């Protein structure tokens, strides 16, 4: 909508207060004009038609409980925008400042979130399994990273390329969480999963096995569920990425960690310059090696740590 840029205030899902960029034109809309061609958050109103109505509020204060998922969806899209711009020099998900749109209050008691090819969608959770999923910055960045991948490598959402697609989203979801630096970890979705159970999550990058995900190529799922297990076999890549950053010994294979930022530079480059829609695991290894090479030199620790990590998860 056409109107004047302003700043609203409200509370997110976890009860935290934050300012949000809005647009005024009779009502205050969740439209952020300070980032690229804009960040727009919508109300799906418990239904599934998308995107719904551009979020509208009479007084620019968003402290209702109904407001919280939109507050966080909107704010964390902005944070994720900032990560990609400041850290990888990338403008929005298409690299050309595409408008970022999100809808919240999708369906009823919907325990999930997703990128539908054109926008982010967030359920409110059933309240026991999940709380509104936009309360999770790793979730928000996971979903926007799916748009990044779709505009770059275009990894097909099936089998090994689909597992890579997933890992990429968990990896930058996590790097963005660290970036915001609020209770960061290598777990996914912990902030909005099972409010009544502390310490769990949907997936663990540091120890995928925690939730039954493989942490080695010899443990890969080869059935047809989950698109050929894209959320399952992603643990093999998540584990490699964790090792590259943090280091460790895994099934007897030692990795020297090079830290999060270099992990991020290497995988961003692999994603945007080498990976293709049908890249498999072994191809990912060669892309990451070439990326590390480009960035740090063939003889680097960096290159050597990337090899160690993939050796440790059995990917040659």
Ligand X SMILES: O=C[C@H](O)[C@@H](O)[C@H](O)[C@H](O)CO
Ligand Y SMILES: CC(C)[C@H](Cc1cn(Cc2ccc(C(=O)O)cc2)nn1)C(=O)N[C@@H](CCCCN)C(=O)O
* Residues at the contact surface with ligand Y, assessed by CB under 6 A: 111-114, 129, 139, 142-143, 166, 188-189, 202, 231
Q: What is the largest CA-CA distance in the chain?
A: 64
Which residues lie across from 7 on neighbouring strands? Answer: 21
Do the annotations mark residue 138 as ligand-binding? yes
Minimum CB separation of residue 221 from Ca ion in Å reads: 23
Closest CA to 158 of 78, 91, 229, 213: 229
Piece of 38-46, 135-143, 242-250, 304-312 that binds Ca ion (CB under 5 A): 135-143
CB 156 within 8 A of CB 164: no
The one catalytic residue in 74, 105, 216, 231 is 231
Q: Which residue is nearest to ligand Y (CB)?
A: 189
Which residues lie across from 57 on neighbouring strands? Answer: 28
Using CB distances below 5 to 8 A depending on partner kind, what does residue 139 bind out of ligand X, Ca ion, ligand Y, none? Answer: ligand Y
CA 124 from centroid of its chain's CA atoms: 18
Using CB distances below 5 to 8 A depending on partner kind, what does residue 143 bind out of Ca ion, ligand Y, ligand X, none? Answer: ligand Y
CB 263 within 8 A of CB 240: no
User: Which tokens go with 43?
Assistant: 């109300």
Catalytic residue status for 143 = yes
Cis peptide before 173 (omega within 30 of 0): no
Binding mask 51-90 for Ca ion (x = CB under 5 A): ------x-x-x-----------------------------
Considering the complex, state which of residue 53 and residue 249 has its C-beta at the smaller distance from ligand X: 249
- List contacts with ligand X (CB under 6 A): 247-249, 254-257
Instruction: Give the whole-angstrom CA distance, residue 246 versus residue 121.
Output: 32
Catalytic residue status for 88 = no
Binding residues for Zn(2+): 142, 146, 166
Would you please indicate which residues are annotated as catalytic (active-site) residues?
143, 231
């Amino acid at each position: 909508i056409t109107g004047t840029s302003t700043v609203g205030v409200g509370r997110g899902v976890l009860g935290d207060q934050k300012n949000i960029n809005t647009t005024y034109s009779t009502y205050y809309y969740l439209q952020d004009n300070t980032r690229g061609n804009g960040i727009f958050t919508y109300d799906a109103k418990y239904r599934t038609t998308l995107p719904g109505s551009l979020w509208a509020d009479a007084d620019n204060q968003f402290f209702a409980s109904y407001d919280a998922p939109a507050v966080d969806a909107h704010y964390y899209a902005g944070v994720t925008y900032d990560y990609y711009k400041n850290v990888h020099n990338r403008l929005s998900y298409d690299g050309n400042n595409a408008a970022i749109r999100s809808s919240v209050h999708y369906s009823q008691g919907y325990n999930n979130a997703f990128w539908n090819g054109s926008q982010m969608v967030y359920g409110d959770g059933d309240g026991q399994t999940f709380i509104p999923l936009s309360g999770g910055i790793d979730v928000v960045a996971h979903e926007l990273t799916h748009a990044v991948t779709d505009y770059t490598a275009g990894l097909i959402y099936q089998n090994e390329s689909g597992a890579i697609n997933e890992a990429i989203s968990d990896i930058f979801g996590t790097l963005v969480e660290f970036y915001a630096n609020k209770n960061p970890d290598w777990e996914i979705g912990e902030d909005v999963y099972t409010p009544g159970i502390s310490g769990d999550s949907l997936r663990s990058m540091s120890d995928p096995a925690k939730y039954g995900d493989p942490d080695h190529y010899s443990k890969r799922y080869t059935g047809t569920q989950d698109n050929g297990g894209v959320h399952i076999n992603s643990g093999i890549i998540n584990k490699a990425a964790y090792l590259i950053s943090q280091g460790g010994t895994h099934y007897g294979v030692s990795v020297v960690g090079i830290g999060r930022d270099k992990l991020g530079k290497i995988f961003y480059r692999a994603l945007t310059q080498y990976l293709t829609p049908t890249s498999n695991f072994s191809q990912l290894r060669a892309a990451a090696v070439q990326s590390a090479t480009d960035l740090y030199g063939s003889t680097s620790q960096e290159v050597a740590s990337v090899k160690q990590a993939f050796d440790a998860v059995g990917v040659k």
